[PDB]
A paper describes a structure:
Particularly striking is the much larger size (~260 amino acids) of their single capsid or core proteins (CPs) which in mammalian HBVs comprise only ~180 aa. DHBV CP (DHBc) expressed in E. coli self-assembles into CLPs which package bacterial RNA. In line with earlier data the major type of DHBc CLP conformed to the clustered-dimer T = 4 architecture known from HBc. Confirming selective aspects of evolutionary conservation between avi- and orthohepadnaviruses, the new data also reveal unique structural modules, including a direct contribution of the very C-terminal residues to the capsid shell and a centrally inserted extension of ~45 aa that behaves like an independent folding entity.
The low folding propensity of the extension domain questioned a direct role in capsid assembly. We therefore replaced residues 78–122 by a short G2SG2 linker and evaluated the consequences on assembly and particle morphology. The corresponding protein, DHBc_Δ78–122, was virtually insoluble; however, solubility was drastically improved by the additional mutation R124E (DHBcR124EΔ). Sedimentation, NAGE and negative staining EM data all indicated the formation of orderly CLPs, prompting a closer look by cryo-EM image reconstruction. The resulting density maps at 3 Å resolution revealed the same architecture as in the wt DHBc particles, except that all spikes remained narrow as also confirmed by the asymmetric analysis. Also, the fold of the subunits in the asymmetric unit was nearly superimposable on that of the full length protein subunits with an RMSD of 0.6 Å, except for the missing sideward pointing density. This missing density was accounted for by the 45 amino acids of the deleted extension domain whereas the flexible G2SG2 linker was not resolved. Difference mapping confirmed that all density differences between full length and internal deletion variant localized to the extension domain which therefore behaves much like an independent internal appendix. Notably, this helical framework forms independently of the extension domain. Of the extension-less variants only Δ78–122_R124E produced specific though weak signals.
Residue numbers in the entry:
A (entry chain A): 1 to 81, 122 to 188
B (entry chain B): 3 to 81, 122 to 193
C (entry chain E), F (entry chain H): 250 to 262
D (entry chain D): 1 to 81, 122 to 192
E (entry chain C): 1 to 81, 122 to 196
The structure:
């Protein structure tokens, strides 16, 4: 495969939003794989970045989910609250969940690059892009995976 | 060792030592943009950039949560104290997270500009000066102009 | 650097 | 200064009971500075002594405070216990408080000597005694310190 | 230190409590054997630890004992203001007793290691634990000892 | 030319 075309086809924001493991499993794997580098106090790029995003998720994910739940409960219980309140709440939750989707994607990217290598990860992304462009019939019955 | 030490020192500060968030983010972006154009992977670059993004993403949402919670509680007739309590808890969590982000951003920005040593020494001196009981102190805090002068 | 890799992690497109 | 006069003016128990940080802060800083040596299972003087005194405080401080609380509560109640009971309890709490004050002072001493050096702390205490015997207006605006430094 | 010495000390922590000399005698002997190292201002592990533990005892032993005494006194006289009084007092005294028992045992270990040697003492304790855990009929009628004490001082 | 420092720590005066 052409390195150039691969790198051009590889981007973490192109993915379907269902390719990404649940946030709990992702955070757990990230922490369990980072513990050595933490204890060693390592200054590697992906270590630093994945640490930042682990912290970001742990901080704001449950708060955003609680905000969405609160907005729904407030619009359900009745109009006693208001429309501006629910609109502002939904907008804040929307912005936060966009930021959290970005954090999730980049945490995945950074963790997988730490494990395997960003070269392997971009190759995998390109090959998965192809697998997804192809129709179900003339492609593998199960998707690829890194060194798999 | 000394890294976590100076970090704990940074956390051991009064919250009135840290500039306003607008000034801080402005200065950080101004100092970092060249490094972005240069595609630099420096540690302080990595961390300050990511904290700037964090702040610009969540600060306004958190302040709005605070204000709307207080307003609807003053109203009193919207849902119940459950909503206000849930909102206060979330806002507290996000506030402490953003405070940590603000502090680490200050630390890394200043380390990048001037020097990690010049910032660590000043922070140690200031933390010591603040610890003491005001009778063995000096009567004049250490001022930030010490970072700017080399040694 | 052939890759964008700006502001540290991969930049959007 | 004259090194002899410095070492002679340097004694931890000369300080007026308020130069010393609070007990929680002191134990916390001591543990934070010790845990490396604890893990490395070190033998050195200051580590050993600071550890012993941390343990002593952890063990007896809260008990002594509770003893004082008990003495005051029984004093308020009046009929409970009695007079000589209150007297003996207060005397015991007082002896324990003397021991714990000595422990706090020695803990400060050894923690700081471990961080910087007992010579540095000696000079610090000496210069502080001098700077503190002088009146306020001829002191200046720069008290004495140790001022750790870092090199890139 | 050696895992042998660690085993010996962990065993000291769990001995029958009748193996240990009276605290008065222990403190006395510790002071008398340490004052030379005090004058010489030595910084040896056992010296430091024994000194600190004997000071600890000197300070808090009689205090804890009087605490017990007065707790029993208030329980006997009655008229307590709530039972929490005696509860908290005896809990404090119990924590003090645990701390002081550990102190006595480490003082014993360190003073005896100073006298004889860490090796001699850990061997002694290994033998004594093997002897105590074992039941009679396979044991020996007389316990083991540090043979350097009860061996004759021969002089021509 | 050494301080008291007896028993390992510093004594009173």
């Amino acid at each position: 495969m052409d390195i150039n075309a691969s790198r051009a086809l590889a981007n973490v924001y192109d993915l379907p939003d269902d390719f990404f493991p649940k946030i709990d499993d992702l955070v757990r794997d990230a922490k369990d794989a980072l513990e050595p580098y933490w204890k060693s106090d390592s200054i590697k790029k992906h270590v630093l970045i994945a640490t930042h995003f682990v912290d970001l998720i742990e901080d704001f994910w449950q708060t955003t989910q609680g905000m969405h739940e609160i907005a729904e409960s407030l619009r359900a219980v009745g109009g006693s609250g208001g429309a501006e309140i629910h609109a502002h709440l939904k907008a804040y939750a929307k912005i936060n969940e966009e930021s959290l989707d970005r954090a999730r994607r980049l945490l995945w990217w950074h963790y997988n690059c730490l494990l395997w290598g960003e070269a392997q990860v971009t190759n995998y992304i390109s090959r998965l892009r192809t697998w997804l462009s192809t129709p179900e019939k003339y492609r593998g019955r199960d998707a690829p995976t890194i060194e798999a």
